DNA sequence: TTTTTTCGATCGTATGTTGTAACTATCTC
DNA sequence: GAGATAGTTACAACATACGATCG
């Protein structure tokens, strides 16, 4: 199976057309672009019929099997599109996909969309059956580090001029949402035919629609950026994330930090990182955390986390977000007079 | 009769729309240059002009003179669209029609050419209420749309739509109308209606609108009814006081400055309407916690409390942290002891008195 | 479901009432775990469902006896939690109540057994009240619990209580020595740890719990001098955390009693550990730690979905903080 | 025979007690001719939301014309009074919460009224509608036909979507005070030819909080207990309220730090068999009232005038710290009351504890 | 077949109930005067006669002779209601019918006229277990029921009902029965059943009842079963684990003297003898209260306790009242947390160890 | 090169599969 | 040409999956 990125998909399609294409990722924009490119190439090759189905427990696989088996009087060269569930395929879906791969024809072009597959999902009969005749395009949203380059390139290909301040504003306002950023660039191009996009011009037609995950919040806490942590927490609250997930994600790192701080008194940090299986890239940030939090801290934080968990579980309270904000400020170097810690 | 202000003053032209320049300018440029997308989506808060702008765009698309951003308003198509009798404009209340069977018949009409219009316009409002099968049918229709049909969507909860639907339409987000624009619109409407008014009443109504023009018009109608055909400062102030439901912040402000009479008056006002005392204590505790967090870092306060941002900022800047902590602890003790008090009101009064005048003695 | 000797008297009483027809329709048995109340309830159920009773024991050959042996008697109902769950829901209670209305298949008595009344939810307990107050004719209910005070007062008021007293200490020690081979001190300590109920000590000995207790004792012996109570986490973070917390609380109580001066201690097989605990800790700190341990054990047993590791880590860090001078200690309150 | 609450429902705007602002606004709107198409009524239970809605419907549909003073004698008024008017569609939202019912209702809104000039939908308990039901009413509510009016009543307005709130005129009814309730009870009893006493009516008004339905229910219960009369003794027995004189005497004895008087009062109460938790609650209330009087001179109400002077004396003598100490001690005693061996024993122990820690005259120290 | 005393002796007439004079008088006056409400609510503790009074009222309403406060008890309606198979008396168990669908189905049938009786009575038991939707659905019809329906509600936790429901019905609160009333009822029942008894056994059973007559009957049945069909002082004392001897006095003296060894020895002896710890704590609390009472006035000491006067007076003179209050508070805290401890003995030992620290 | 959640009980919406009743077309006398 | 039988369409009941609220 070939492995590719969205930029190389067009080159591969020009090279030739394969039997099956797998589009796995979490970025709707890149998935849509890849699907559109593949369908345009197929239509150029002579695929004028397309079908789409949604994979779910209440799915009619008989129709799909009949479509695969049946011929066409004149409208041949069929294209089939599948949309996997957000959670991912299960054993029933695994065997259904294996059966579908068994009934594969040269005139049928298969496309699959869904989230990134894990090792357990990857190690499946249907997945291995397509290994010799498949190409997988990875569509992952770039991080904040690589985002400005992507924004600059996208603006360049649209024949627009972006200032550094405008690029920073666009990255800040639409972080983790590339579809919104592309639509914003299109609207800006519509507003200003001359294509000159300055800071005051962009600031007028931009709204905050960022998307985050709990791992981003934990990373912000580790780095020590109060503003970014608060912004991420507010965005997560607006989205409607479950507080328990955030509590567990913070708990894992907090307990790891407590153990490392306790056992680093008479041991080098590198050996501890090696023993605890810390990823190489993260070892940087963790280090500075151990240079910013004392043993007196990381105990008040644990106490506050336990109190928040108890309040959420037994009391069914609604002030979980306030305690989360307090803990976020506590992890950053702030007084946090402890009247709110109940210590 | 006199009709209703909200219905009577529907924007019938792009010039009548208040604000929303970043959307109107883009739409006008697109219409002038011929760059028209297949699907448009409009998002924003309540009463910001999503439906009005959608109807104006639909009118502009199918005008007799041509595709223009300034509809004539006199040809038969414009009048029919204004009156809601245009054959080629199909308006779908997705909230009322959610089942797939209802949507299928409406979506199957795309196979017929327009009768008396260049485009066949579908205006689906409240589209976030559709079911999964309806969304699938809509996506299938949008995959291969005929060149002579356009789709306009309006909703207040865009996150409810599938990503597949979102990725195939151009989205415009409307903003709040701000106090000044709302006040100017209210003044213009009252001047056109020949209704006496005062600047202070208009300012109060605009401030109470909270970024919604429909709320402002409803409040203006209620004030006119209360004032007996006139808008006056005293009548509007009394009406707003009747609807006022922010006793927690006022109580906090009165307590912080040690004003017992104001505290008693606020307690009486809260008791006048049906309120839960424990809820009031919880709200006061939350406000104190937010003030403490803001004191720790200015970024703690977000856009959710934009209505009372100034008062919270002033309290954070003025009050020392120690007083805030003392009040928070006193209110915690009061909430803890509330169940065993002789009465809920008596418990709240005792706790407020203790916060006002007394200081607990801690061990050691 | 072993039949212990000390169940001979009590049974001979209860069944006697059922012979005379003076039997209460709702019997609540109070007994510690391992006392064999389940065996007594099973014997009573077998007696009630026998079509041809002889003496105080079932015939064993009638159709009812055969069905009970096969475990497919239509008129026998059991209310227990699901395999993966921990509480008894209201749906099962409602279904049993609706099924009780119709006549018995074999035209005899109907028996309903609740495995543990303490696991009933509030909704299930409230739903059971109406059925328990005025059950249909020839219907018998059996309930078992450890602490009747934990049950709903209205539910409790509708039952006849019967209490099983543990046998004397010497008899229990002799029985345990007969069953298993061990030192006298170990047997006595196991018996006292189980509140004097035989079988629970046998459960401790037959399993690997004794090795876990030894590991916990060694860890505590290491931790007490140095003062690093965090190291105990590995010895406490387990699915059987409440039992180990109970053992730790017992050790602390024994140390405190030794400090005050006493002749009897629950942990008689480890004098050194209790002596070290008494020497190295003051009475106030011992009381505070004991209270915290009991509170954390209660929270673990009560709250559903609580995270074990976080609570144990917080408890250990709190204890370490308390060990520092000049720290205000908790005081019990309403 | 007929229940007072149902019998004495207001039938004209003059019969409504309080709610002056809402009535004035409605009358001005009806007189001027500026009539909206969506009204929302909010307030606590038993304040007259449904009554005012029905009065507004009568005014809209009266045969004489659109007036703020319905005649009350034409066919439409009588039918609305009897609940048999065809054009007044009353919906119980608490029962029909499903979207299917809402769609069925909306499918027949364009048909003209049978006999009246308007078709009025009165939806009660609208806060119980489902989310789909709420979202299905947005467009029809925003732009109803000319001959359609919507009236909504609820006690939990905050559960409605903001979109619904933005489309209607909101009126918040306020709880009634003691004076208005007492006057209404006096009027009703005078019309019913039932003997009464001022103190009984004052007690009933204070015990009804700010709801007239509760006051009428308590009046019916008192009439049943009193055997055709409303007497102060009967009402006091029904409400289980002890004389304020005894509680004030107990508080004064506790303050003076004379145990013999306290024990004598306890024995006297036990002779009658006074409820002890009620005694503790009354003492706590008296202490709280004294503290409030210390805070503000005008805190004391009129109902306590009979003892007002006495109260003032304490406010002039007892330091605030002593009042706080007594209040806290009694609160703790009430907290620990359930677990005491007996209620009498618990109250006696609480009073002994209060005497032992008396700020000025503690019990003698043993030699 | 055999019916327990609680089921057998359910009152069948207004004159057969014990206590609750105010409720009975109010109901009788309302029935006589013709002022009949359409919504009655009964509140109180457990086993006080809420359901009994509700059934008596329902029987009186539908009696063939007429609406009277003294049902005949012999006509067809009275007999059918007593047997619990009367068509027009619909009894709902809200603890198992919490679903709003059941409530809607019940309300849909209120338009039908009664079959035989002049009223259609609905008796909802454990109404506090209904869901919020059920209460809201009830509200409208409960406000203005048809002329041929009545609602009777019985609950033990009226706090959980919404204020809107409480505002629509006449509320009757039932007081907890006194010790003397329970003792008299037990004596009457035993005399009617021809069972030997002694005054002290009845006194102990009434005291242990704690204001609930159902609990008293259950305890009496247990004593009869465990006492070879006879109620005797020794049998009841053994069943309840009465302290009898002055073990509590010695234990409190040892606690006050701050002698840990003596306290532990006494606790070990008590555990070996197998007494009830709750009774021990209650006796200690009573002794502390008596000692505190005596300090205020020497004459406060009871005459029935004229066997340990010297020790009690010594304790009263030697111990300041503040220490007595501290010990009382500690014992109350121990009693509160006793059921939640790993073992009763462990909890008692913890309480005593905590109390031993209050000595300089 | 990964790290993703508390549980029980209750209410509401939409879709798929199976069974029954009423009316129409076809078959037989 | 009429009555009886077979076939078709519409409505109701039961089962499954997904989303939301309060304790
Ligand atoms: N931008 C605007 N300019 C002028 N009037 C507005 C504007 N936005 C809202 N309104 C007024 O609010 C009323 C309702 O607006 P509506 O079309 O419901 O907006 P939405 O669809 O966002 O709720 C209209 O009658 C209109 O008069
Ligand atoms: N303002 C008022 N004036 C006169 N009577 C009132 C008033 N408010 C309530 N009542 C009485 O209370 C009873 C119930 O009122 P109701 O219509 O239920 O109000 P709500 O709808 O707010 O509960 C009525 O029968 C009426 O007699
Ligand atoms: N006031 C009373 N008079 C006589 N017996 C009573 C009384 N209250 C309760 N009982 C007895 O208690 C038993 C249960 O009472 P019950 O009707 O369940 O009261 P509740 O509904 O309050 O639990 C009855 O069988 C009856 O014998
Ligand atoms: F009609 Al709206 F927000 F209320 F678009
Ligand atoms: F009928 Al209501 F509050 F009880 F409006
Ligand atoms: F306490 Al009950 F019915 F048993 F009210
Ligand atoms: Mg709109
Ligand atoms: Mg009403
Ligand atoms: Mg009952
Ligand atoms: Zn035109
Ligand atoms: Zn047999
Ligand atoms: Zn009229
Ligand atoms: Zn009769």
């Amino acid at each position: 199976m070939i492995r590719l990125y969205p930029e190389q998909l067009r080159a591969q399609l020009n090279e030739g057309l394969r039997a099956a294409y797998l589009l796995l990722g979490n970025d709707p924009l890149l998935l849509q672009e890849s699907q559109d490119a593949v369908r345009q190439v197929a239509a150029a090759q002579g695929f004028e019929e397309h079908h789409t189905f949604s994979i779910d427990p209440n799915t009619d696989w008989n129709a799909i099997f009949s479509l695969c088996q049946a011929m066409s009087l004149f409208a041949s060269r069929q294209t089939l599109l599948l949309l996997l569930p957000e959670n991912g395929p299960n054993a029933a879906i695994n065997e259904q996909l294996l059966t579908l791969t068994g009934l594969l024809h040269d005139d049928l072009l298969l496309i699959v969309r869904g989230n990134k597959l894990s090792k357990a999902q990857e190690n499946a009969a249907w997945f291995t059956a397509l290994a010799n005749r498949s190409v997988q395009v990875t569509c992952q949203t770039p991080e904040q580090a690589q985002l400005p380059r992507w924004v600059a390139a996208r603006a360049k290909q649209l024949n627009l001029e972006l200032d550094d301040a405008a690029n920073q504003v666009l990255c800040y306002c639409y972080e983790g949402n590339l579809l919104a950023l592309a639509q914003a660039l299109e609207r800006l191009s519509l507003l200003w035919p001359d294509g000159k996009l300055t800071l005051p011009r962009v600031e007028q037609a931009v709204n905050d629609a960022a998307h985050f995950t709990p791992f981003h919040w934990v990373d912000a806490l580790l780095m020590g950026k109060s503003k970014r942590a608060l912004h991420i927490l507010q965005q997560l609250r607006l989205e409607g994330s479950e507080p328990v997930i955030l509590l567990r994600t913070l708990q894992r790192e907090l307990l790891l930090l407590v153990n490392l701080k306790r056992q680093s008194a008479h041991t080098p940090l590198r050996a501890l990182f090696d023993k605890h299986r810390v990823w190489q890239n993260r070892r940087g940030m963790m280090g500075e955390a151990l240079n910013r939090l004392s043993q007196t801290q990381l105990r008040q934080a644990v106490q506050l986390l336990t109190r928040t968990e108890l309040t959420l579980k037994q009391d069914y309270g609604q002030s979980v977000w306030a305690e989360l904000e307090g803990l976020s400020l506590l992890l950053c170097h702030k007084p946090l007079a402890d009247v709110f810690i109940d210590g | 009769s006199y009709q209703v202000l909200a219905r009577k003053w529907r924007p019938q032209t792009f010039a009548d729309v208040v604000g929303q320049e970043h959307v109107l300018t883009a739409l006008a440029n697109g219409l002038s240059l011929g760059r028209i997308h297949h699907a448009y989506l409009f998002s924003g808060t309540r009463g910001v002009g999503k439906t009005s702008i959608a109807r104006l765009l639909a009118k502009g698309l199918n005008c007799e003179t041509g595709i223009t951003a300034t509809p004539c308003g006199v040809c038969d198509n414009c009048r029919e669209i204004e009156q809601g009798r245009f054959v080629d404009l199909i308006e779908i209340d997705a909230a009322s029609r959610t089942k797939v069977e209802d949507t299928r018949d409406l979506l199957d009409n795309v196979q017929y050419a327009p009768a008396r219009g260049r485009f066949k316009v579908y205006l689906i409002d409240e589209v976030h209420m559709l079911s999964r099968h309806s969304f699938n049918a809509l996506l299938k229709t949008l995959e291969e749309p005929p060149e002579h049909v356009k789709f306009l969507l309006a909703t207040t909860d865009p996150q409810k739509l599938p990503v597949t639907i979102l990725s195939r339409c151009l989205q415009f987000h409307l903003k709040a109308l701000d106090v000044e624009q709302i006040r100017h619109q209210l003044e213009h409407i009252l001047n056109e209606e020949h209704i006496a008014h005062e600047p202070r009443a208009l300012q109060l109504l605009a401030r109470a609108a909270e970024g919604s023009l429909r709320d402002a018009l409803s409040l203006t109608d209620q004030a006119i009814a209360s004032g007996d055909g006139q808008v006056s400062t005293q009548a509007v102030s009394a009406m707003l006081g009747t609807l006022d439901d922010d006793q927690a912040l006022s109580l906090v402000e009165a307590m912080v400055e040690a004003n017992g009479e104001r505290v008693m008056a606020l307690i009486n006002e809260a008791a006048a309407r049906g309120i839960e005392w424990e809820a009031l204590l919880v709200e006061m505790l939350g406000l104190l916690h937010r003030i403490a967090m803001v004191q720790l870092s200015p970024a703690a306060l977000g856009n959710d409390m934009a209505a009372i941002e100034l008062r919270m900022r002033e309290l954070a800047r003025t009050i020392p942290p120690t007083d805030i902590q003392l009040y928070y602890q006193t209110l915690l003790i009061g909430r803890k002891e509330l169940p065993y008090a002789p009465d809920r009101r008596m418990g709240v009064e005792m706790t407020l008195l203790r916060a006002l005048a007394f200081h607990p003695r801690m061990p050691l | 479901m072993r039949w212990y000797p000390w169940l001979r008297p009590d049974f001979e009483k209860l069944v006697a009432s059922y012979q005379a027809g003076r039997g209460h329709h709702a019997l609540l048995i109070q007994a510690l775990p391992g006392m064999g109340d389940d065996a007594l309830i099973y014997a009573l159920s077998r007696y009630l469902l026998c079509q041809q009773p002889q003496g105080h024991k079932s015939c064993g050959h009638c159709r009812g006896c055969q069905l009970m042996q096969a475990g497919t008697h239509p008129d026998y109902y059991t209310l227990a939690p699901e395999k993966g769950k921990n509480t008894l829901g209201v749906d099962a209670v409602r279904e049993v109540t609706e099924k009780l209305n119709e006549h018995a298949r074999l035209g005899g008595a109907k028996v309903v057994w609740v495995t543990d009344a303490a696991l009933l939810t509030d909704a299930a307990a409230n739903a059971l009240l109406k059925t328990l107050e005025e059950p249909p004719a020839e219907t018998w209910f059996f309930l078992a619990t450890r602490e009747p005070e934990r049950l709903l007062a209205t539910l409790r008021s509708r039952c006849r209580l019967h209490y099983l007293a543990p046998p004397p200490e010497q008899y229990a020690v002799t029985w345990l020595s007969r069953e298993v081979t061990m030192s006298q001190d170990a047997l006595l300590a196991a018996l006292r740890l189980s509140a004097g109920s035989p079988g629970a000590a046998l459960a401790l000995f037959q399993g690997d719990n004794w090795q876990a207790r030894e590991t916990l004792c060694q860890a505590l012996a290491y931790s007490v001098p140095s003062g690093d109570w965090y190291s105990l986490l590995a010895a406490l973070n387990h699915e059987q955390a409440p039992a180990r917390l109970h053992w730790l609380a017992t050790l602390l109580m024994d140390a405190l009693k030794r400090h005050h001066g006493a002749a009897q201690v629950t942990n008689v097989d480890v004098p050194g550990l209790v002596a070290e605990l008494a020497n190295h800790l003051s009475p106030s700190r011992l009381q505070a730690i004991l209270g915290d341990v009991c509170h954390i054990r209660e929270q673990l047993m009560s709250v559903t979905g609580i995270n074990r590791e976080l609570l144990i880590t917080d408890l250990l860090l709190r204890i370490e903080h308390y060990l520092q001078p000049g720290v205000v200690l908790p005081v019990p309150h309403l």
Side-chain angles (χ1 to χ4, degrees), chain C residues 257-271:
Chain C
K257 293 167 64 176
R258 176 55 54 185
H259 173 279
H260 267 71
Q264 176 170 341
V265 297
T266 302
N267 305 122
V268 302
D269 59 331
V270 285

Side-chain angles (χ1 to χ4, degrees), chain A residues 32 52 179 183 186-187 189-191 204-205 207 226-227 230 234 322 325-326 329 334-337 339-340, chain B residues 22 25-26 29 35 37 143 166-172 175 289-290 292-293 296-297 299-300 302 325 328:
Chain A
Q32 269 289 352
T52 176
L179 179 62
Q183 290 184 347
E186 184 175 2
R187 290 186 296 92
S189 71
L190 274 171
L191 288 171
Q204 293 173 11
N207 61 94
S226 59
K227 288 175 58 51
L230 293 171
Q234 291 175 5
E325 293 172 5
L329 287 176
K334 300 293 177 59
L336 209 279
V339 176
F340 313 95
Chain B
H22 65 289
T25 302
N29 293 334
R35 297 167 57 181
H37 296 62
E143 278 177 358
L166 294 173
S167 62
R168 305 189 79 86
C169 62
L170 183 62
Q171 181 176 353
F172 292 94
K175 304 187 295 186
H289 191 90
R290 176 55 58 86
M293 296 302 95
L296 287 175
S297 179
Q325 298 170 17
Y328 185 80

Side-chain angles (χ1 to χ4, degrees), chain C residues 1-332:
Chain C
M1 189 178 294
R2 192 210 295 268
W3 177 269
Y4 306 97
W6 57 85
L7 301 175
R8 185 87 289 179
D10 299 328
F11 175 80
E12 291 291 354
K13 203 192 306 310
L14 297 175
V15 67
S17 61
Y18 292 96
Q19 280 184 349
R22 321 295 287 184
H24 207 287
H25 59 75
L27 184 65
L28 180 63
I29 306 302
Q30 180 183 354
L32 297 172
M35 286 297 297
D37 61 74
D38 55 358
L40 178 62
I41 294 170
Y42 182 80
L44 293 174
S45 301
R46 288 292 303 275
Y47 171 83
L48 288 173
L49 293 174
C50 182
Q51 297 179 354
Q52 307 177 16
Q54 66 92 352
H56 298 272
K57 63 215 75 62
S58 59
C59 75
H61 58 246
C62 75
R63 180 167 178 79
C65 290
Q66 298 177 359
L67 292 175
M68 290 297 293
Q69 300 243 32
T72 64
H73 204 291
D75 301 329
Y76 185 77
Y77 304 93
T78 304
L79 286 171
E82 299 294 349
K83 60 185 296 304
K85 303 299 185 182
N86 187 26
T87 60
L88 180 55
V90 68
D91 303 74
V93 177
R94 280 204 286 267
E95 98 188 358
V96 169
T97 294
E98 96 189 357
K99 258 151 59 177
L100 283 172
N101 288 18
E102 61 186 0
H103 289 259
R105 274 62 179 181
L106 282 65
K110 295 177 287 186
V111 180
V112 182
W113 176 31
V114 181
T115 303
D116 187 2
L119 303 179
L120 284 166
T121 60
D122 186 68
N126 285 273
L128 191 63
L129 297 177
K130 216 75 182 301
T131 305
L132 198 65
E133 188 181 8
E134 299 177 348
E138 301 295 347
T139 305
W140 313 98
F141 289 85
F142 297 93
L143 298 86
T145 182
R146 301 175 63 269
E147 184 64 16
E149 299 294 346
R150 305 290 290 276
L151 299 177
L152 197 66
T154 56
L155 183 65
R156 192 198 315 171
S157 191
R158 290 165 166 76
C159 301
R160 174 187 161 187
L161 181 63
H162 181 67
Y163 173 71
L164 276 57
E169 192 177 26
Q170 184 62 16
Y171 176 83
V173 169
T174 303
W175 186 84
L176 287 173
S177 65
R178 202 80 60 75
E179 291 292 347
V180 71
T181 175
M182 219 70 174
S183 60
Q184 301 297 346
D185 295 359
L187 296 174
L188 191 63
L191 185 64
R192 291 181 178 177
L193 286 171
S194 300
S197 64
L202 187 64
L204 280 171
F205 282 114
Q206 61 85 8
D208 62 328
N209 303 327
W210 206 247
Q211 183 60 19
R213 180 175 175 276
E214 291 181 0
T215 301
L216 177 59
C217 286
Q218 292 180 0
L220 185 59
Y222 163 77
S223 298
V224 166
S226 60
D228 183 8
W229 290 71
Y230 184 73
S231 178
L232 299 178
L233 177 61
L236 297 174
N237 186 17
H238 195 266
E239 193 275 349
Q240 299 294 343
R244 306 182 184 183
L245 294 173
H246 174 58
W247 301 341
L248 181 61
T250 299
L251 283 164
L252 296 169
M253 168 172 290
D254 293 1
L256 188 56
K257 293 167 64 176
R258 176 55 54 185
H259 173 279
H260 267 71
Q264 176 170 341
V265 297
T266 302
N267 305 122
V268 302
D269 59 331
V270 285
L273 182 57
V274 296
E276 294 294 349
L277 280 167
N279 296 331
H280 286 56
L281 287 84
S282 60
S284 56
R285 297 176 179 177
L286 292 169
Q287 291 179 9
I289 297 166
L290 179 61
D292 285 8
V293 169
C294 290
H295 187 51
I296 293 297
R297 180 180 176 277
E298 182 60 20
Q299 284 183 342
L300 284 174
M301 293 181 65
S302 179
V303 181
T304 61
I306 193 67
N307 192 268
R308 189 191 309 96
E309 185 180 4
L310 185 62
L311 264 61
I312 295 175
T313 300
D314 187 8
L315 172 59
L316 295 176
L317 296 177
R318 193 191 312 168
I319 292 167
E320 289 187 359
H321 181 246
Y322 286 177
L323 259 61
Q324 303 299 343
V327 182
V328 183
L329 303 174
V331 56

